């Protein structure tokens, strides 16, 4: 039902410059978000964000962003696998020119099953979600905060 997808999560990544300075020094960055529910009842999800190093083959200096399913309170009353459309965004806090990727679920992927551990090791998303030079040029980071949004809509 529609109420199972009514949630929208905005991940506030504070002190972004700290991660950036470490990334510039050649440190991979990986961040794990708080959990959120697509609805009540609904699916429990979390996000994983990477800053790839300046020398990573094929994806140097990118933000990578992946969605992971989790074991949630409502799981017994949900259909599985999770099916729908997932919208991932980095938000423009002033001009509304968000960077948005839209992706449909795939029912045959482990990432959309209910995991047998608390957090699914398999996630789904973009290795090359947003390049750090594009993030800088657009000025998405305001007061050292990056906003990452995740919305799920039904089929």
């Amino acid at each position: 039902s529609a109420q199972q997808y009514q949630g929208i999560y905005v991940w506030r990544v504070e002190n972004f410059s700290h991660h950036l300075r470490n990334q510039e020094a050649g440190q991979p960055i990986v961040l794990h978000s708080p959990p959120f529910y697509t609805g009540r009842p609904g699916y429990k999800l979390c996000l994983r964000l990477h800053l790839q190093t300046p020398s990573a083959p094929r994806c140097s200096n990118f933000i990578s962003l992946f969605v992971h399913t989790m074991q949630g309170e409502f799981d017994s009353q949900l259909s599985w696998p999770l099916q729908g459309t997932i919208r991932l965004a980095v938000l423009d806090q002033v001009e509304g020119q968000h960077h948005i990727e839209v992706m449909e679920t795939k029912p045959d992927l482990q990432a959309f099953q209910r995991p047998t551990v608390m957090r699914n090791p398999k996630g789904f998303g973009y290795v090359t979600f947003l390049h750090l030079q594009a993030l800088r040029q657009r000025g998405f980071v305001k007061e050292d905060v990056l906003l990452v949004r995740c919305e799920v809509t039904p089929r």
Binding site: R48, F66, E101, M103, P121, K122, G123, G125, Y126, V127
Partner: peptide
């Protein structure tokens, strides 16, 4: 892209 990746 998008793709499934593994993060233990």
């Amino acid at each position: 892209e998008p793709v499934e990746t593994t993060d233990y």
